[PDB]
Structure formats: C-alpha cells, structure tokens
C-alpha cells in the first residue's frame, strides 16, 4: 500500500539569500548586485544603480529580516513538515569583495547556524552557490563573469563552502537559472546571472556567451572539487525551464520552437554531456562571436558534469515564424513569442500551464536521463488579509496543486526520476524581477509592504495547512 | 573553396533485395514474406496469403530482374557517379528456411558478385541485413520474431554476412525501419518487420512489443559479433523518421506529440543508449503487457549499441488530442493523427515537408549525438514517357532538391553530423506498401507495369542527369 511518489520524496520550500535575509551589512557582508537594485513593479523595470545611492529604495537591504528571524521561520517550515529547505549561501557573506585570500568567518558561521537549525527539525538543506547575488566589487573591479579571473574566485568560494558544510549539506547546485541570461536584450539577466554592466557599443550577445562560458567552466571545476571533498555530495545544475511550444503544426513554427529550445537549453547540454552542441559553434560563426575557450576549459567541462538537473518551472511559452527577415531561424525572446490561447495567466502575465511541467519532466528525462529536482514553482499574486486575520489564497492552492498533480503523473505514469519539489518563496519575500513585496508567493504571510512599512510579523495563509497536508499524505491529498 | 557538405559525403541510392531482384527461386532461394504478398494499389491493401497461392499475383517474384541485370544497372549508378549503393542481403538467399546449420553458397556468391561490381566503379556497398523479407518458413514454423529462437537465427545470418563481406562492406544496418510496427493496428508492419501473422483474440500490441524486443536484442548481438569480426565496420540502426508535430500549442496536443514520439522512437533509445526508457516499462506495467526480457537481454542491449543512426524520411505527421477516452495519452497511429493543413501531398497522400527533414536531423542530433545517414528519401509518382523517350520528372527533381536543401542547412547551419544521402528506389522497383510498379521513384525508368508486362528495359529520366550534377557538385548545384 504505497503512494505514487517515493517515501523519501524531498518536499520542501525554496528561497534565495538576498531576497529574504536582510542584514545586508551584518557580519562584514559585502555589497552584492542585489544591493544596488531598486524596487519596481509589473511593467516598470528595477533600476540598476552605480552603487548605493541616496534617494533610492533598495528593498533587499532589509528584506524580511530572516537573518534575525530564521529560528522562528524554520519552526514554521517544520510545522508544515518540510523534508528539505532550499536557499543560497550569500557569496558576499563569505567573500565580501570576492577576491579575498581568506573567507569571512562570521558569514560561514551564519550558515552553520542556519543549517544546524534546519537539521534539528529533520530538514535537509539544499544549497545554491550563486543566486543573483555576486559581490558588486567583482563587477566594478573585474567586470564580473566577463573576466576569466572570476572563475577562480567562484571556485574558491565553492571549495570553501563544500569543505565547511561537507557533512551538513547533501544537495548542491552551482548557478541559479544559468540560462536566464540568454535573454541578453534586457539588462536583468546579464547583471544578475553574471555581473555584466553594458556600455554603448557592446555586443551584448557576444559578451553574454563569454560570461556563460566562464560560468559553465566554473560550475564544472566546482563539481569535480566538491566530489573530491565528499564523493557523496549531490551536485546539480539549475536551469529555468520555460517550454517553448510551436504555435501550430506549420513546419516553420515547429523548427522555430526546436531551435529556440536549443538556444535556451544548450546550458543543460554542457552541464550534462560535458561538451557544447555543434549548433552553438555554428551560430557563433555566423554572428562573428569569438569566445575565449581553451583546451583546459574543454577538459574541465568534460570532467565536471552534474549529478542531477535542478530546475524552476512557472510557465510555458509559444513561438511562431511570423517574424520577417529571419532566414537563419534566430530566436528573439522579446519578438518571436505569442500568447497561448489555451491557457490562463497570472496578474504578472505568467502563463499558467501545469501540464507543461509534465512535458518539461519528460523532455529533460528523454534528453538527459538524470534525476530531476523541481527547485522552484509558485504563484505570485496580490494577497489580501481577511477579517479572520488570514489570507485566503485559494488561487495559490489551485495553482500549486495543479502542478503537483502533473508532476505525480510524470513519476507514476511516465517513469521520470524526481528527487523532490520545493515551492518558491515559501515565506513571503522580495521578488526578483520587480523587487516587490506585493507579488506574494508564500505559505507564510509577512507583514511588510512595498513602502517598507509593516511589523514584519509572520502568519500562516490558507495554503499553509493545505501544504502541510500535502506533505503528510506524500501527495495523495491535494 | 570548400563546399557546405564534407568532401567524403556518401551520395548514393537505395533499394531492397525483394523489391528489385526477382530470381525469387534462383540459387535455392527460399520463400520470403515478400513472396506471399499480392499486388495492391492506393487504398487497397496487399493480400498476405498463407503460402504462394494459385490465381494470385505476386509482384516480388520477378520484380525488375535485377538479379540478372545488375551489371548493367550498376553501370548506370556509376554513370550518375554514386559514392555508395544501399541494398539488402536477401535473408532467404543465405538461409532459405532460416534454421539451416550452414549458409547457402550460391546466395553468398551472388552478393560477392554484386558487391564486387559496385567496387569496380568505386561504389561503396551499404547493407541492410533485414529488409521486409524474412524467411516465410520462420513464420510458419516458429511464429517469426515472436519466438526467442529466431534471435539466434538472425545473429547466425548476420555473422555469416559480416565474415564473408568483412573486407567489402564498410556500412551495415540491422533491421530496416524497425519502428514501423509501432503501428500494430494494421497487418503490414507487424508482418514485414517481424513475421507476425495475427489471429482472432490476439493482443496485437503485446505481441508486437515482444517481437520488437527480440529484434532489439538480435540487433545488439549482431553489432557485437560484427565488430568482433572487424572492429572497423560501421554498424547502424535504421528507423523510419516521421516527425510527429502537435496540431497546436494546446498543452494537450503538445503532450500527445511528445508521448507519440516516445512510442514511435523508443527503438532508437534502445539502439543508441542501450536501455529501454522508463516510460516503456511503466506503459507495459499499466497495460499488463508481459515481455520475456532477461538479464542477459539487458546486458546484450547495453553492450550492442550502434555506431550511427540510419533513417528514412518521406513525410511528417500531425497529432492532436481529439480522441475521446484516452486519459493516459496512448498513441494510436491509425486514429490520433490528423492532416497538416500547411503542406501539399503526393498522389498516395504522403505529406510533402522538406523542412521536417531538418527537424529530424536536429532531433536525432540533440537526443543522441551520433552520426546520421539519410538512407531513404524519395517521391513516388506516376511517370509518363514523352516523345523523346524520356520521363520529364520535374516533380521528382523538385521534391528531392527541396530535401537536399534542408539537409544542407542542417549540416552547414546546425552542425549535424551527416554521413550521406541515398534516395530511395533510384531504379524503378516494386513498391512496399502497395506492391505497385506505377508508384515510381527512380532516376532510371523501367519498362514494366502492374500487370507484369513490358520489356524491362532501363532508360534515364530527366532526374538522372540532374542527380549526376548534384553529386558532381557535391550539392552546390541543385
Ligand atoms: O520573484 P519573481 O520575479 O516573481 O520570480 C520568481 C523566482 O523565480 C526565479 O526567476 C528566481 O530563481 C527567483 O529568484 C525568483 O524570485
Ligand atoms: O514503396 P513505398 O510503399 O512507396 O515506400 C517507400 C519505401 O519506404 C520504406 O518504407 C521502406 O523501407 C521501403 O521498403 C519502401 O519501398
């Protein structure tokens, strides 16, 4: 009499240090790229400023003060019955500037305290090494991951973490959503993935590919080093999975979708297979893109392939071939996509396609034959607190439950290997794309708004007990 | 000044023994499954009879008498400048019944003669071991490839061929279009792939999966013995690649297409990766399909993976989720497919989709990262001989040229590894599905009709000199 998922399935929740910790200067922590991004809103991009300026609002400085509240917050995770908790180690807490000879003890101690607290309640940490929060010093001084020197800085950081937590953290990922930067047209991904600040005349695409290359090399070096430190460590990649569907069976739409997926997921090919697909080299040739790519890089990549694929899933896309002057079937994320008329969308226009998660799980399995870990899934929405003092987020329950149903079908009917599932922003935190508190994801409401006002009190939403019962039934009761 | 295709590109043409040789009783040849299939036409199935019956017309018995005319025909291939020539070794010429302890010398000598003739002109043989022509005795005595005993019979046959031709044939494939039988609803594929004759009450699908399993094991064992005889032999699989497009971006259509591709191409996963995808095991478990599948089989499959993927391409398909009562997203090739509203079609209703060949080349490359060989592509059409004594088959030139253009883009722009290209039915022969002469594919016209009359004289069509120029220009001039 067993359920459809394995008994040890890793139910949990996921966050990122810069989005919830606050304490942005505590323990000698350095300024991160998140610390120079102002608040925005749907339709209004966050301002990336040259340092911390007066007259600007930086929501990540204080966030929800998890740095101080974590013991109480972790109690809440335990009440829901989390089996794991995904977060990031703030690079700037360990290497404030990035190029220090020795790591920061106060930073390392904080994660000792945090991971110890999780383990007290039987909650396994899942750690992302780089999650959109590299030291700003690496940006101004070195040019971020456009600089081969930054590879060694990351590997140093990774090695320190692997060694410190080798007996406390079983699950690791190197670069959060490493493929986001493929959208090089907008500033968000390049600045966050990679510490790239563009100037007039820059070939944004060529520079993106160079930084992505250095990150893939850094990831591979880190994987090898982590396994040397402890061969039992599970070390994965992390890609944002937004399946791109052809609009119709017109062969042109079909090829557009195939070629768009190729360009957005070559990162996974490198992480998994250890070499670049040939279509990337051909593309670079047509665009006259030159990438500093050495024989040592080739060896590192081949020897540092990942144990599993971590991924985020929120939505799917649709592409067609309506665009003129596209003889090479290039993909422009900002131009070739169209709306899917068969699905609904969030208030931030993120398409709701739970069946796409089943598609995604099958796609990764068929392509790569590795274990998968859904390390983000969530529904960002405006919450209202009712007269009973609780947010009745039936909309969030509906979204999450629909996705859980599809992932269960992938395991039970399709045979995919799925390690676990960690809803994003399980406690309300500062959003990434827009920097809002109002775009809420949590099972736990936090009393703080986009003007920085509120008590910061935590309270369960309707979805809190719902998810508690999901975990307790191992997914049988949704 | 190099061409877009590599210099060593294997331009050629492809046929199958039973479709052109005739001489069906010569040299002690046994009755094959082809020898018990009567002629049909479009919309009229060939009759599969119990032995050779009086009053029935069997077009494969004489075909175009290539058994006697091969020296003159090979000379025409040489005039077109073929780099290679693909055909099959008739299983029934080597093992007339299938279960003989020793091979037939007259059969082996014929292929020595044929391959020698090719090599006199620098034409490299490409050999398919099983191409819809297994010994009919294996059907009646053992139940064809539904019987584990037939594995050893095939491997014996393969070993004999590898040894005899180890220094004459560089390129081999095991089972022609092994995946056709994914369509188990009609009699054709199960009979021709596997020697399956169904009776009332049979679980057609379960029986197919069993025969497919024994063939995949046989293929793996054949690869192993071939490489043991001569490790330089290139031994590939052969799948029919009909890409299955979703009709629309409806997530249900998307999932139907993904699952249909899984069911139609798991054969390739086994040939390439050396293990069955888990979605097959889950499907069998759900459907209560039991397969005789041993640990020795598992080891053989893992050890006997192929060097390259040979495939045929003629058309693409479209699927949708219209069929009711299909909650598990099963694939029925005869019910779930729909017409592509964006394409034209041949007079036998075969959809014309040259871009789908580019999709196909990318799909195999992304999934398997092996060299590919397009070993069939062609346009079957009615030909008229004009007053100048020549068929002006501009329609055939148009189809082949359109496909060549797409394959060149796959190599030049997408970086696929493509070994060569061999148009199907390069000399007019007896068709497979309908057993017609009138459904012509050739660069070379053969004067024989569907009543079996005519001189059997060979004459070039307009496409003959066209293809001669394609090869001479290595595809620069189409
Ligand atoms: O916060 P958003 O903009 O709504 O996006 C949700 C999350 O999904 C991913 O993009 C990131 O890994 C997270 O950092 C981000 O918060
Ligand atoms: O002869 P048909 O029915 O038109 O199909 C063309 C060819 O395509 C493939 O299905 C077979 O491998 C060949 O044997 C066959 O002849």
Author numbering:
A (entry chain B), B (entry chain A): 0 to 477
Sentences from the paper on this structure:
SmBgl was also crystallized in the presence of the reaction product 6-P-β-glucose. SmBgl–BG6 crystallized in the monoclinic space group P21 with two protein molecules in the asymmetric unit. The final model consisted of residues Ala0–Ile477 in both chains as well as 1145 water molecules, five ethylene glycol molecules, two formate ions and two BG6 ligands. Substrate-bound and product-bound complexes of SmBgl contain a phosphoryl group attached to the glucose ring occupying the phosphate-dedicated cavity. The O3 and O4 hydroxyl groups are both kept in place by Gln18 and, in the case of O3, also by His130. The position of the β-­glucose O6 atom nearly corresponds to the glycosidic O atom of PSC and the O1 atom of BG6.
